[PDB]
Design an enzyme around this catalytic site. Structure first.
Site, PDB file in Angstrom:
ATOM      1  CB  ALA A  73       4.737  37.281  39.888  1.00 45.56           C
ATOM      2  CE  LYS A 126       7.972  36.190  30.241  1.00 47.48           C
ATOM      3  NZ  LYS A 126       8.326  36.032  31.643  1.00 47.48           N
ATOM      4  CE  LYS A 163       5.428  40.927  29.724  1.00 40.28           C
ATOM      5  NZ  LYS A 163       6.080  41.307  31.027  1.00 40.28           N
ATOM      6  CD  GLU A 215       2.442  43.169  31.389  1.00 41.30           C
ATOM      7  OE1 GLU A 215       2.199  43.451  32.838  1.00 41.30           O
ATOM      8  OE2 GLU A 215       2.475  42.092  31.253  1.00 41.30           O
ATOM      9  CB  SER A 228       9.335  39.386  32.216  1.00 42.31           C
ATOM     10  OG  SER A 228       7.730  39.106  32.403  1.00 42.31           O
ATOM     11  CB  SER A 239       4.927  38.008  32.538  1.00 47.52           C
ATOM     12  OG  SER A 239       4.986  39.249  32.933  1.00 47.52           O
TER      13      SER A 239
END
Ligand SMILES: [Xe]
Ligand SMILES: [Xe]
Ligand SMILES: [Xe]
Ligand SMILES: [Xe]
Length: 263
Positions: free
Chosen positions: A212, A209, A48, A141, A105, A45
């Site tokens: 995982a 930020k 992002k 994602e 997230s 993440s």
């Protein structure tokens, strides 16, 4: 500081997994600490932030507007979408999507934002054109979290992401308004509580930020500093471990404590 480097080394042995670390002086770009700086790690993440950097660049150019409203359907919702699952009827503005992607997230938010810029390949093209020929996004994602050993898809390096984050936050790329917006979203991060923030004294600034993914991957990017102003960039990744999320969190928190103590 060398003892921070020690904490990194010890984390690597204790987690039984590669750990990458960069400590960057925000003002001059001078490297203060590094470990495996040219090795690849899954971004998870942490991508992002780069994604909304690309979005903001399009805003500056007038190709995008922060208030533009996007509607989507129930079929668009992938795993972990705490914000976007609440707006199937009213939709969300581009600004709200980036807020969701960075502060919470939100995964579907990230996917919708990727669509606005032309997908992972175009995020990679954006990075390429701002001087990062190393970092690459390939998938969406949630598949970008797969973290297959030695897979280069959806990876960055400690040094590449540190320099790219510095450029996004302080470089000539974005307008001042867009830099401020980006840092404001990162400062409002709500899902990195037990990581670097845990080591942070009162009065300190942090914009970050975390990420995982599969196969023990964990990471965080951050701009932080004393007296309410950031002065360093820290990037930290690990992948491969069989450790619980909680131990990976604690290892990062311990590196953070060393970072602060020897600031
Ligand atoms: Xe910053
Ligand atoms: Xe770590
Ligand atoms: Xe920290
Ligand atoms: Xe850290």
């Amino acid at each position: 500081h060398p003892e921070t480097l020690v904490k990194v080394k010890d984390a690597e042995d204790q987690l039984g997994a590669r750990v990458g670390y960069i400590e960057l002086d925000l003002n001059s770009g001078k490297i203060l600490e590094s470990f495996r700086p040219e090795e690849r790690f899954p971004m998870m993440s942490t991508f992002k932030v780069l994604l909304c950097g690309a979005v903001l660049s399009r805003v500056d150019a007038g190709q995008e507007q922060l208030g533009r409203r996007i509607h989507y359907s129930q079929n668009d919702l992938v795993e972990y979408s705490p914000v976007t699952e609440k707006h199937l009827t009213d939709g969300m503005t581009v600004r709200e999507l980036c807020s969701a992607a960075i502060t919470m997230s939100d995964n579907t938010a990230a996917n919708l934002l990727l669509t606005t810029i032309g997908g992972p390949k175009e995020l990679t093209a954006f990075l390429h054109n701002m001087g990062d020929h190393v970092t690459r996004l390939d998938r969406w994602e949630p598949e970008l979290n797969e973290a297959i050993p030695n897979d280069e898809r959806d990876t960055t390096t400690p040094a590449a992401m540190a320099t790219t984050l510095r450029k996004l936050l302080t470089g000539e790329l974005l307008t001042l308004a867009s830099r401020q917006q980006l840092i404001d979203w990162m400062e409002a991060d709500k899902v990195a509580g037990p990581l670097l923030r845990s080591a942070l004294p009162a009065g300190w600034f942090i914009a970050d930020k975390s990420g995982a993914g599969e196969r023990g991957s964990r990471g965080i990017i951050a701009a932080l500093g004393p007296d309410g102003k950031p002065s360093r960039i820290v990037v930290l990744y690990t992948t491969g471990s069989q450790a619980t999320m909680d131990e990976r969190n604690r290892q990062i928190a311990e590196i953070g404590a060393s970072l602060i103590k020897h600031w």
